[PDB]
Design a protein around this ligand. Structure first.
Ligand code: A1H5E
Length: 377
């Protein structure tokens, strides 16, 4: 018997299946913020205070180092992660302890209006330069002041960390020992600024969060969108203007660079302060199972944590492009692994937001970012 509390901020469907096979166990969803940094700030407060209310925590792929070192989670003792994609086995392992079980993979893709590219004879762009030239050509034809060339995240949210690193990684650089490439940091901030200055992105991109990009593209207002796999279900759902009008490509590269992307995804941890440790673990073993991974791929376009589900016939029937997504996820670059990740994120996202709001130049942004990261890495 148990009333379990899960922090998830279609999962209700998965929880109803567990309840239907587990008599005397009911599960209630709890929330605290939309974007991941908001969820982190909240969980820091209640975990710091040893709050026993939550049993299971849905945590971002960037969280296990913090949660492990603070002793905020109950480790899966003797657990083998070898069935999961190795990138997620590694992320959920800290000094040899299994901190959490993978919930779903994720990576950033380029969503595009394949109807608009097709009308203008344009191929999916492989460089930001090709994306600019495509946007200009489509915008000149459409004469549509509501049509944005490129939606990307400029709000001071976790997503803007990812935004900063896409061009940095593309140029072949790494952040981590801190290894700050100033030229590539300014080049990243200049690129995102250049879309606002050129009109290819809207004047207030600094106000745009992950799900703003999702809603605006879904409403038919965006040619090109940087986003995560979950967007797909919404694009092809009942309140979309873009059903059957969406292509998915690897992100453009910077001139002469690689088509790199950011690793994302989430995992289920058990709270160290949970009073229902045994039933919490059993719920997490169900939620991290292959059957539930498959259900979440088909019903919510969450990329699987199991390699085999990428080319499972029921998964590809629903989302054909998942068959091409496995190597993108497998090769995706990771945000720095550190217990102090919240300080890394805070520095990077506020610098991106400031540059895009015009509050600081890319040059001053990069300098201030490097000074702040030095005290943290
Ligand atoms: C039914 C459940 C749907 C939720 C699936 C996507 C959640 C957002 O997660 C993605 O974006 C984060 C940035 S942000 O949007 O929080 O700024 C990244 O950190 C994550 O790694 C990535 O998976």
């Amino acid at each position: 018997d148990a009333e379990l509390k899960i922090f998830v901020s279609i999962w209700r469907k998965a929880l109803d299946q567990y309840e239907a096979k587990t008599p005397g166990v009911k599960v209630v969803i709890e929330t605290g913020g939309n974007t991941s940094e908001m969820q982190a700030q909240y969980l820091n407060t209640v975990m710091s205070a040893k709050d026993s209310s939550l049993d299971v925590l849905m945590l971002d792929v960037i969280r296990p180092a913090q949660f492990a070192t603070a002793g905020w989670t109950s480790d899966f003792s003797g657990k083998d992660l070898s069935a999961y994609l190795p990138t997620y086995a590694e992320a959920n392992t800290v000094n040899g302890k299994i901190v959490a079980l993978p919930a779903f993979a994720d990576s950033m893709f380029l969503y595009y209006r394949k109807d608009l590219l097709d009308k203008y004879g344009i191929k999916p762009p492989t460089t930001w330069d090709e994306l600019k030239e495509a946007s200009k050509k489509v915008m000149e034809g459409e004469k549509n002041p509501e049509l944005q060339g490129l939606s990307f995240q400029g709000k001071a949210i976790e997503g803007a960390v990812c935004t900063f690193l896409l061009p940095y990684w593309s140029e072949g650089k790494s952040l981590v020992k801190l290894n700050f490439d100033n030229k590539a940091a300014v080049d990243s901030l200049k690129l995102w600024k250049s879309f606002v200055d050129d009109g290819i992105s809207k004047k207030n991109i600094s106000e745009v969060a992950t799900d703003d990009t999702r809603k605006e593209f879904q409403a038919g207002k965006v040619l090109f969108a940087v986003n995560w796999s979950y967007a797909w279900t919404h694009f092809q759902g009942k309140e979309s203007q873009v059903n059957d009008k969406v292509g998915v490509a690897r992100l453009p590269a910077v001139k002469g660079g690689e088509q790199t992307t950011c690793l994302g995804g989430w995992e289920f941890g058990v709270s160290a302060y949970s009073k229902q440790q045994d039933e919490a673990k059993k719920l997490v073993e169900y939620l991290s199972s292959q059957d539930v991974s498959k259900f979440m791929a088909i019903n919510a376009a969450l990329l699987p944590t199991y390699a085999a589900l990428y080319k499972d016939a029921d998964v590809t029937k629903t989302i054909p492009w998942f068959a091409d997504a496995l190597p993108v996820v497998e090769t995706a670059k990771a945000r720095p692994v550190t217990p102090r990740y919240n300080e890394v994120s805070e520095t990077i996202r506020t610098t991106v937001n400031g540059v895009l709001a015009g509050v600081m130049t890319p040059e001053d942004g990069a300098k201030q970012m490097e000074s702040r990261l030095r005290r943290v890495l």
